[PDB]
Design a protein around this ligand. Structure first.
Ligand SMILES: OC[C@H]1O[C@@H](O[C@@H]2[C@@H](O)[C@H](O[C@@H]3[C@@H](O)[C@H](O)O[C@H](CO)[C@H]3O)O[C@H](CO)[C@H]2O)[C@H](O)[C@@H](O)[C@@H]1O
Length: 241
């Protein structure tokens, strides 16, 4: 359908790469496409990344660039938006007042955990009569076996069960962050995971959209393309339909 998207940055060849891979949507972690010209049929989704992104100017920019709005990126991490639940909720009315379909902040992990960041955000939002239309999630698997897709599915199901909001998977890949440096799968393991995970996500009715992290190897070792050339993972992602 229209589920398959990617995160992207401007690199030489990005327009070609978005069209080649069949991305129906994309985002840039910013309020506008950050210099990317989208192919026809590829929808841009703006993001309000952190506390300092919440300005009349950024919110007007976002509304001019797209119709769906993603909120803060990994507020639960000191290295990312680094925001208390209270701060996110206090800023929420400015994002709500755009009128756009509105995604929760994307937590790095523990979205299903009672008392965790997302739980306290969703409980506070309900108590304040706020609108949260969908929940975007991040998932990085450290088990590089064929079991990985079912572990991803379990997390998405858990979050769906807890808040009953449609799910977006705005970043996912196999990456183990448990050690002092990141661990990555082999190219074959990564391509097999792309195939099996996309088949799973295409069939899961409460997942509206997904986005592999990320389109370009300039962004991450789990990239799908180097310039306009897909690797075996890009090939598998293109084939996901
Ligand atoms: O909007 C105000 C705000 O902008 C922030 O800049 C963001 C970057 O934080 C963001 O970085 C992305 C990471 O969050 C993510 O994990 O990885 C990707 C890929 O490497 C990064 O792009 O990227 C967007 C797009 O360039 C920027 O707008 C500032 O960090 C923040 O201080 C400032 O308040």
């Amino acid at each position: 359908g229209t589920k398959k998207g990617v995160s992207a940055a401007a690199f030489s060849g990005v327009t070609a790469a978005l069209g080649d891979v069949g991305a129906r949507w994309f985002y840039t972690w910013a309020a506008d496409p950050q210099g990317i010209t989208a192919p026809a049929g590829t929808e841009f989704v703006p993001m309000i990344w952190g506390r300092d992104s919440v300005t009349a100017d950024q919110l007007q920019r976002a509304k001019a660039a797209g119709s769906t709005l993603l909120a803060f990126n990994e507020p639960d991490l000191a290295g990312q938006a680094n925001m208390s639940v209270e701060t996110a909720l206090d800023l929420w009315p400015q994002l709500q007042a755009t009128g756009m379909r509105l995604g929760a902040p994307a937590v790095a992990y523990g979205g299903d955990t009672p008392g965790g960041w997302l739980d306290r955000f969703m409980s506070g939002a309900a108590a304040r009569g706020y609108r949260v239309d969908f929940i975007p999630l991040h998932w990085y698997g450290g088990d590089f076996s064929a079991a990985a897709t079912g572990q991803l599915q379990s997390y998405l199901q858990a979050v769906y069960n807890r808040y009953h909001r449609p799910i977006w998977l705005t970043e996912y890949a196999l990456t183990d962050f448990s050690g002092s440096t990141p661990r990555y799968p082999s190219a074959a393991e990564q391509a097999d995971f792309v195939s099996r995970s996309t088949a799973m996500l295409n069939g899961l009715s409460f997942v509206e959209r997904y986005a592999w992290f990320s389109l370009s190897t300039s962004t991450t070792p789990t990239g799908l393309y180097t310039g306009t050339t897909p690797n075996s993972s890009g090939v598998a992602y293109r084939a996901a339909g």
